[PDB]
Amino acid sequence: SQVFGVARIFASFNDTFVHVTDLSGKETIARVTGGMKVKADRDESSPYAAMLAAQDVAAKCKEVGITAVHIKLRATGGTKTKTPGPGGQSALRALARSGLRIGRIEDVTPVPSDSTRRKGGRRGRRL
């Protein structure tokens, strides 16, 4: 039927990565980040930039032959926050609305079975 890639979307709170690989993930097809679409650091992770980033990925996917993708959304993970950034929701909707077909969707955020120490100190970040 369709030809599947894998859209590995890494959505932090400072930027948004839209990265499409092959099934193995060892071959990169298109990687457009929200920071390549704006010149202000404060909105590298904006929903608007993520939508533009996804459209460039979808356009690149079409000329290589990728007609469908599986979605593996992730947050920063590790010792830091596990909730996805604001751009992850926009990049997913933009991909679906760009004529690309959507397969399986999974959250693959790095979660610890314990945890190393997290930055900020004992008293947290005082603002």
Partner: protein
């Protein structure tokens, strides 16, 4: 400047006969040149595909299979079983409060000397007539359940080859036997083999693999 995608050659990925829908998908690699063959740099790749896709049924939507390519025949990729895992969301949906979570793992080798680590997970079952809020099992029962898990995974893996076990994993044969075997210990729910890892493989036998491809 060069558009590196003009030099890529596409290959087809074929799953073993243990699954139904053997047409997994397509991959690509740099085209075979004189210095480097495409074949040798292409083996060893691992593909993670949902088990519901390999079987059509949506009942396997929460398991995802790693397929390892270890032989190339023209434009076809002959993959083998590389590992098993649950989706992250399914596990998060199973771990509720007011109940006990019990886990076990064991390292065991198959008939054909495939060394695996198998991870089992289970939860206490609330009885239909139960009134109390929580469903906790005493730690002694959990030790017996954990002990019961280990001897079942050890028994049902060392007595068969990896291919028959793959046919065992799909219908949760081990998970159903653990639930049956622990009925007299404690009522259990959601008994699953939630992860399987290949640690060590025997010496490569292309003939044995070819029998797993038709």
């Amino acid at each position: 400047v060069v558009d590196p995608f003009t030099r890529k050659d596409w290959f087809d990925i074929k799953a073993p006969t243990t699954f139904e829908n053997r047409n997994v998908g397509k991959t690509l690699i740099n085209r075979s040149t004189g210095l480097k063959n495409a074949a040798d740099g292409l083996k060893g790749r691992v593909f993670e595909v949902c088990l519901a896709d390999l079987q059509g049924s949506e009942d396997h939507s929460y398991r995802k299979i790693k397929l390892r390519v270890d032989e190339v025949q023209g434009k076809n990729l002959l993959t083998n079983f590389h590992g098993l895992d649950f989706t992250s969301d399914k596990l998060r949906s199973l771990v509720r409060k007011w109940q006990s979570l019990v886990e076990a793992n064991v390292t065991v080798k198959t008939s054909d000397d495939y060394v695996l680590r198998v991870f089992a997970i289970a939860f206490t079952k609330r009885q239909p007539n139960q009134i109390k809020k929580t469903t906790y099992a005493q730690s002694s029962k959990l030790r017996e359940v954990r002990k019961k898990m280990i001897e079942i995974m050890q028994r049902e893996v060392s007595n068969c080859t990896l291919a028959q076990l793959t046919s065992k994993l799909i219908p949760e044969v081990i998970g159903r036997e653990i639930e049956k075997s622990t009925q007299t210990i404690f009522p259990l729910q959601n008994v699953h083999i939630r992860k399987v890892k290949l640690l060590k493989q025997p010496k490569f036998d292309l003939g044995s693999l070819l029998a797993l491809h038709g």
